[PDB]
Design a protein around this ligand. Structure first.
Ligand SMILES: C[C@@H]1CC[C@@]2(OC1)O[C@H]1[C@@H](O)[C@H]3[C@@H]4CC[C@H]5C[C@@H](O[C@@H]6O[C@H](CO)[C@H](O[C@@H]7O[C@H](CO)[C@@H](O)[C@H](O[C@@H]8OC[C@@H](O)[C@H](O)[C@H]8O)[C@H]7O[C@@H]7O[C@H](CO)[C@H](O)[C@H](O[C@@H]8O[C@H](CO)[C@@H](O)[C@H](O)[C@H]8O)[C@H]7O)[C@H](O)[C@H]6O)[C@H](O)C[C@]5(C)[C@H]4CC[C@]3(C)[C@H]1[C@@H]2C
Ligand SMILES: CC(C)CCC[C@@H](C)[C@H]1CC[C@H]2[C@@H]3CC=C4C[C@@H](O)CC[C@]4(C)[C@H]3CC[C@]12C
Ligand SMILES: CC(C)CCC[C@@H](C)[C@H]1CC[C@H]2[C@@H]3CC=C4C[C@@H](O)CC[C@]4(C)[C@H]3CC[C@]12C
Lengths: 380, 388, 40, 199, 390
């Protein structure tokens, strides 16, 4: 097989333009438009957009020669995912009325895919990412619809499982990919992205809560848990390292451990000390996973999945205080995990198709595959 | 003389202080103003940092030009609105000051790497007056709807910078320059600026919109126009390059074309699919411009655009103006078609004339202009560290 | 279901999950006991 | 249409179909619209046996495409180490330049093909040969961040031809076909090694 | 011992958890955007402003994040105890804003000792400096009742003087003549420009977060905005003036452009007028550039006080200009505050910072926190796994 990348001058433009034309046609046929707090409602969605673009594009840009692709592909995936998620959430919760709240929900749905893509960035091209975006948005919408139909929950309120869904979907897709690093300036850019994610994660911890009191309590808990998690992660990076130094890449992923741990139950926490305890437990679990998971591909995605599972478990624990309820919650969690694994397997099987012109395994984590650089021999 | 720039800056600052003391007196729109502020100072500042040896000058001159521009635009716009009387300062005055700074930075993007800071101060001072007069004309005499300022800001600044670069044309730089090249980390910083502009563009297009339906319409239209514009820019960037390679200039610039071209129709009821169509067409036009029209302007028309601000602001600005005209024809807004056409034509003509006069003023060898060999180099005005 | 059925404290998914959990516990206990033998 | 089928068989590695077409009377030196003959298509896809069979069919080894690339250029750019070795053993010019001045060493260096770089340097590739823009394999390797290629290029320097001439290798292995192809390309049978011995 | 830093961090986190469980319980959403702007300032702008060092970006940003994360919790605890007089208190948006303010003060002090201290020393310095800063702020706000809504004296000058005092105690003879690692880089200065721009853009929210809603908050926003606008121009002009052949210095552009925001804080809510604010910004920028050009070498070589980021010329001297402007403003009728109270607040801030700095530096001087050697100063390899490539 030729290690030189195949020409995508006819596959990628045709695919992207066809997707955009289909999106425009569907918006024309199925979408319709529509006060005092318009700016206040827009600010939450703006924070979600800022996270999804900046933090999730630069957080994976820590690679030595794959930061361009990480950032630009994250932007492209967000732009496609919001547009497709608007239509999918309109279809599965019913025409589609487009509001700021629907834009916020589609932004969360795209954030799920952006989190999943971190396990597969550096090993796929743009068309495979488009396929992953479409399939993952459809699978998350189907999971939310099934949960709403079975457990009598709300379709928009089933978006709380997006941490665990994104993590397991990303791991499952990365498992199916063919088997195959850092620099200072890309690490600083990833630190900027991680800082933005850490600062604005309280917004993503309460976009679905309606009452102001629950949102305020959730933001308090997320803020304190995130502070505790940052302290614990920066402290314990030296413990879980053979060189006895602090790993910047580990910090980039473990800054968010407390926010992930308290994400599903930030409104149920009645006092900030419990949130701080949860953040400390999240940080210690992150240290343990960083020290143990590589022994038994993406370590950060694996510890993110472990943190999401821990957050679900502590939600189960906290829900009892505030038999059949535990069974319903565990069944919902198991259904989410099974659907995420099945959809990840399907997406990985579709991503191995030869028609996508995937990069060679020896050309992984390189921007030279997808980007033009001067003084290069082109073609044969 | 090395004392020209500090002396001129001090004199301009003293003049601004005197004008504020003579004409200037004393929270819902504050977040929008902050988003616009972040756009103007970070996104435009780092979008021009793609040059390998001109990042320092680009970001520093962006900061200085915008800082002088907000004050001078506040003064001139308040004088125009108050007809020479004293005026109070609200959030809208600061937003319009940031808009004037945006126009001046758009013009500066055309002459990046070929001008001195003194020339940039002079260009800011003249271009703010020209832009404010054109904006007052459009808003009061024509009474056209340009809530996103596709014509009064983007096209005006683009054609102003094109005229300035045409007057300041260098024969030796027509065939290219060694320093006129990008870098990996420089392009990453340019991506920082591109992402910030892309994320905060809806607040830019909805800062001065009427609260209620119009502001939400502007936000939604800008959001979906940018969303479609990113996909079309990526597709056409892959299309126009060999073997489907993505060009970093296209990804950094053409992704904002949908935000540029949706400004005129932001508050109009053009519908989300119409905004997406506008953004798609804007992205296609921007990529095609960057691929073909920029070499034509540089080599044949002798108009050198360093950042390609024409394909980002002027052509998408004209597209937005024509889109506003058509939306008026389609009944999206109750504005007059003739007034919209007159606003577009007046913006283009005033931009060209002001750029001509400003470039003629800057052409004098009195502001420490760099030589042809020292273009696109930070060492002319900055202390460059030994290591990268 | 169909017609009128007697109301129970545990629903059908609940009771089948409880039965499956009890069966899994019994299977695990038997496997652990078998693993204990043939070694000591 | 038969030539198109032969080129498709060469690209796909179907050696039997290519041999059948050559037996029928299809020209060996036929090429597509891009100038890539059967040898170029075989070198791109790593079909070593097809390359050997076509070289045995008196194909022109130094044929250039419309971009000026030879078979060795295409094999180095595609990262086919075995094809590069086979082409060098049959007498490919390791210092050939394309239209824009690219060399097989430059193409191997820009694509992080360390094994191809090592083999070309051991076989006499000159890294001091620059393109029309003045870039060198070391410069393009530094630009693309290929650290191993940069290290090997710096360490090797100008050690020169450490391998034997291809005719000496053919004589050592008693390879009559490779020796016949080499003598068809270079008529001189008394090529001298560094020690001074003929094949 | 390599286990000192994680053990101390875990103990401090457990202490914070216990204190929150013992003393902490549950206008907010109106001031939340201002809190978010202040948060972005504290964590991005200050974090990347110190990334100008070529071999210390990792340590600068990571220690900024860790120090501010511990600082918000410890400042919340101490400020709530001071305001509630030892009783339980509720948490609003203002508590978080004041916590970010305490983190800002600690980061200002950290900027003085950048590249010469260990993370353990930074944890200890945060713990002590928050107590000192909160006591001084409570004194100024309650006993003196001075108007310092932008905290030019209680935050900027305090952190600057507390940092200089730790830096003089921690002074090393080998570093007085300079250091090879104490140098900037092109991309490092670009990251420093990221931080500078974020601080410059979000400074009006910093100066107007805790202002009284209505006239005072808008006055603070407008004054900070125009003070920064004039400060940028004056900083550029004087940076060109003080250097050979009119070359612009990246340190001046990165730091002195915020001097107008620093020095307008005391007079932010006062009705100084936009012109009055532009006059202070123009002066603060001039003073900051002159300080960076002349006073920093004199302080480093003659006083044995080494300022890594030049936080003195950015926070202390502009802070004293800010305190001085407020006394002048009360004299001129901008504020109904007392001139003597403003002077006492400035003097108490300076004195408390220097007494707290010397005692924190005396504590940090013990060779128990893994202090780096003179050869390993300004190097990420002491505490971080540095990638092979840049
Ligand atoms: C802005 C304020 C002003 C006031 C102040 O704070 C900042 O200035 C600071 C600065 O002046 C400090 C001094 C700087 C010089 C220091 C010198 C030092 O001794 C030196 O120690 C080194 C070894 O580490 C030398 O080698 C040599 O062994 C010896 O020369 C001494 O141990 C403490 C010292 C005298 C410091 C004491 C405390 C200060 C005076 C601080 C003082 C509070
Ligand atoms: C803004 C654009 C689209 C329209 C207006 C273009 C005008 C303002 C500019 C663009 C190209 C310019 C010309 C380009 C080249 C030359 C040759 C030079 O030796 C003298 C100036 C001269 C003759 C310029 C005069 C001004 C010019 C005509
Ligand atoms: C450069 C210019 C001329 C090209 C772009 C103009 C065209 C393609 C755009 C801009 C104005 C747009 C129209 C503006 C308003 C409306 C009314 C709305 O209810 C349906 C869509 C519709 C009818 C839009 C369709 C697309 C449109 C016609």
């Amino acid at each position: 097989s030729s290690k030189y990348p195949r020409s995508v001058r006819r596959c990628l433009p045709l695919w992207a333009l066809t997707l955009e034309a289909a999106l425009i046609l569907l918006f024309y046929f199925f979408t319709h438009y529509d006060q005092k707090g318009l700016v206040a409602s827009y600010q939450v969605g703006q924070d979600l957009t800022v996270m999804a673009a900046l933090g999730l594009g630069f957080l994976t840009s820590n690679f030595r020669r794959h930061s361009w692709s990480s950032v630009a592909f994250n932007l492209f995936m967000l732009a496609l995912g919001v547009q497709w998620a608007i239509l999918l959430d309109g279809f599965l919760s019913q025409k589609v009325v487009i509001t700021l709240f629907s834009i916020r929900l589609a932004t969360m749905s795209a954030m799920s895919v952006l989190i999943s893509a971190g396990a597969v960035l550096g090993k796929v091209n743009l068309a495979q990412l488009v396929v992953m975006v479409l399939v993952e948005v459809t699978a998350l919408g189907t999971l939310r619809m099934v949960i709403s139909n079975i457990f009598n929950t709300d379709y928009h309120m089933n978006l709380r499982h997006f941490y665990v869904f994104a993590a397991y979907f990303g791991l499952t897709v990365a498992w199916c990919l063919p088997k195959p690093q850092r620099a200072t300036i890309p690490s600083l850019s990833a630190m900027l992205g991680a800082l933005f994610l850490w600062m604005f994660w309280p917004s993503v911890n309460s976009p679905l809560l309606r009452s102001p009191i629950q949102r305020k309590n959730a933001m308090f808990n997320t803020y304190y848990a995130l502070a505790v998690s940052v302290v614990t992660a920066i402290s314990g990076s030296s413990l879980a390292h053979p060189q006895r130094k602090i790993s910047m890449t580990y910090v980039h992923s473990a800054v968010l451990a407390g926010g992930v741990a308290v994400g599903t139950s930030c409104h149920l926490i009645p006092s900030p000390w419990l949130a701080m305890v949860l953040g400390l437990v999240a940080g210690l679990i992150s240290i343990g996973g960083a020290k143990c998971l590589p022994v038994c591909i993406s370590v950060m995605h694996s510890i993110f999945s472990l943190l999401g599972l821990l957050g679900e478990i502590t939600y189960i624990v906290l829900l009892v205080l505030h038999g059949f309820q535990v069974l319903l919650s565990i069944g919902e969690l198991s259904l989410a995990i099974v659907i995420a694994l099945t959809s990840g397997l399907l997406t990985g099987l579709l991503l191995n198709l030869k028609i996508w012109k995937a990069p060679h395994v020896a050309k992984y984590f390189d921007d030279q595959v997808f980007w033009k650089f001067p003084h290069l021999a082109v073609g044969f | 003389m090395r004392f020209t720039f500090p002396l001129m800056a001090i004199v301009l600052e003293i003049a601004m202080i005197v004008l504020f003391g003579l004409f200037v007196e004393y929270f819902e729109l504050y977040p929008l103003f902050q988003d616009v502020h972040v756009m103007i100072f970070v996104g435009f500042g780092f979008l021009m940092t793609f040059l390998k040896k001109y990042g320092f000058s680009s970001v520093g001159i962006n900061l200085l030009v915008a800082a002088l521009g907000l004050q001078w635009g506040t003064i001139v716009q308040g004088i125009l609105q108050s007809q020479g009387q004293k005026f109070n300062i609200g959030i809208k005055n600061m937003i319009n000051a940031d808009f004037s700074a945006a126009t001046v930075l758009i013009s500066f993007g055309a002459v990046l790497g070929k001008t001195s800071p003194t020339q940039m101060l002079i260009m800011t001072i003249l271009e703010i007056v020209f832009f404010a007069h054109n904006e007052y004309l459009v808003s009061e005499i024509f009474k056209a709807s340009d809530i996103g300022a596709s014509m009064t800001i983007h096209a005006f600044g683009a054609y102003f910078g094109l005229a300035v670069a045409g007057i300041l044309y260098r024969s030796g730089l027509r065939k290219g320059h060694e320093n006129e090249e990008s870098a990996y980390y420089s392009d990453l910083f340019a991506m920082i600026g591109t992402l910030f502009l892309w994320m905060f563009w809806p607040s830019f297009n909805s800062a001065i919109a009427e609260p209620g339906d119009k502001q939400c319409r502007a936000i939604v239209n800008t959001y979906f126009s940018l969303a479609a514009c990113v996909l079309t820019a990526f597709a056409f960037s892959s299309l126009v390059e060999h073997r489907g390679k993505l060009n970093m200039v296209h990804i950094q610039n053409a992704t904002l074309a949908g935000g540029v071209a949706v400004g005129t129709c932001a508050d109009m009821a053009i519908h989300p699919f119409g905004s997406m169509i506008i953004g798609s067409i804007a992205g296609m036009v921007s990529v095609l411009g960057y691929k073909f029209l920029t070499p034509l302007f540089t080599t044949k028309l002798r108009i050198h655009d360093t950042c390609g601000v024409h394909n980002l602001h002027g052509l998408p600005g004209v597209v937005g103006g024509l889109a506003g005209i058509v939306a008026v024809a389609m009944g999206a807004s109750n504005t007059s078609m003739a007034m919209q056409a007159a606003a577009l034509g007046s913006s283009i003509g005033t931009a060209v004339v002001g750029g001509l006069m400003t470039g003629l003023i800057l052409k004098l060898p009195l502001w420490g202009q760099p030589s042809d060999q020292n273009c696109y180099d930070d060492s002319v005005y900055w202390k460059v560290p030994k290591t990268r | 279901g169909e017609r009128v059925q007697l109301a129970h404290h545990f629903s059908e998914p609940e009771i089948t999950l409880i039965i499956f959990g009890v069966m899994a516990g019994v299977i695990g206990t038997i496997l652990l006991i078998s693993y204990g033998i043939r070694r000591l | 249409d038969a030539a198109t089928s032969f080129l498709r068989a060469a690209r796909s590695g179907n050696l039997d179909k290519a041999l059948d077409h050559l037996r029928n009377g299809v020209d060996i030196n036929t090429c597509n619209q891009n100038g890539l003959n059967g040898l170029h298509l075989a070198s791109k896809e790593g079909h070593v046996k097809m390359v050997v069979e076509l070289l045995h069919k008196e194909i022109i080894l130094e044929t250039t495409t419309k971009k000026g690339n030879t078979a060795l250029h295409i094999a180095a750019l595609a990262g086919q180490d075995e094809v590069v070795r086979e082409l060098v053993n049959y007498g490919a010019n390791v210092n050939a330049q394309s239209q824009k001045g690219f060399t097989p060493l430059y193409m191997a260096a820009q694509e992080n093909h360390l094994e191809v770089v090592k083999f070309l340097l051991e076989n006499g590739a000159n890294q001091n040969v620059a393109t029309e823009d003045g870039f060198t394999p070391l410069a393009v390797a530094l630009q693309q961040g290929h650290e191993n290629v940069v290290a090997h290029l710096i360490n090797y320097g100008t050690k020169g031809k450490v391998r034997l001439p291809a005719l000496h290798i053919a004589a050592r292995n008693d390879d009559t076909r490779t020796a016949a192809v080499l003598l068809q390309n270079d008529p001189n049978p008394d090529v001298l090694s560094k020690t001074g011995f003929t094949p």
